[PDB]
């Protein structure tokens, strides 16, 4: 559908921001686990990958339709801890706040596009 193509980029950006938000909050929650590595995703490359499948064929009514079913990069440690935990509070707190801001911005842009498509139709 053409409607999907217009809203594909913002939807994928919003979903990627939510996933990275979950990853950052997991990094915050597991700050005290000894031996836990701080993981993160490269937002731009994954957004390229998602932006850049074959529903199985249903011959009749009984035939069952096809059933549907990111890469994590390690953060470079800054300070060496003794328990092997590489999670840094300041870095991930700033990243968490930034991801929240960008999620809000994506919501704003997507809502503006939908509202414009709506006022085009209203009449």
């Amino acid at each position: 559908d053409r409607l999907d193509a217009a809203l594909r980029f913002q939807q994928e950006a919003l979903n990627l921001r939510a996933q990275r938000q979950e990853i950052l909050a997991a990094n915050i929650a597991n700050a005290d686990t000894p031996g836990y590595q701080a993981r993160d995703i490269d937002f731009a490359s994954e957004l390229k990958k998602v932006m850049v499948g074959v529903a199985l064929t249903l011959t009749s009514s009984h035939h069952i339709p096809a059933q549907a079913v990111v890469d994590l990069l390690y953060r470079v440690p800054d300070q060496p801890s003794l328990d092997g935990n590489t999670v840094d509070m300041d870095r991930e707190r700033t990243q968490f706040a930034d991801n929240s801001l960008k999620y809000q911005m994506g919501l704003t842009v997507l809502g503006s596009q939908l509202k414009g498509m709506m006022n085009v139709l209203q009449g």
């Binding site: 199985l56 249903l58 035939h63 069952i64 059933q67 079913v69």
Partner: protein
Amino acid sequence: TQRNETSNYEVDRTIRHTKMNVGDIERLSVAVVVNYKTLADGKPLPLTADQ
């Protein structure tokens, strides 16, 4: 381990429509009686098992 398998099949199909004939035979029973054998003398000699 996780295996999710979905398969759609096409099957052979045979429809047979039959209208039985009216007047067919269900059960036949037959009674046959034979005579004896009267020779030139005239004695009614019975038949044999083979015959």
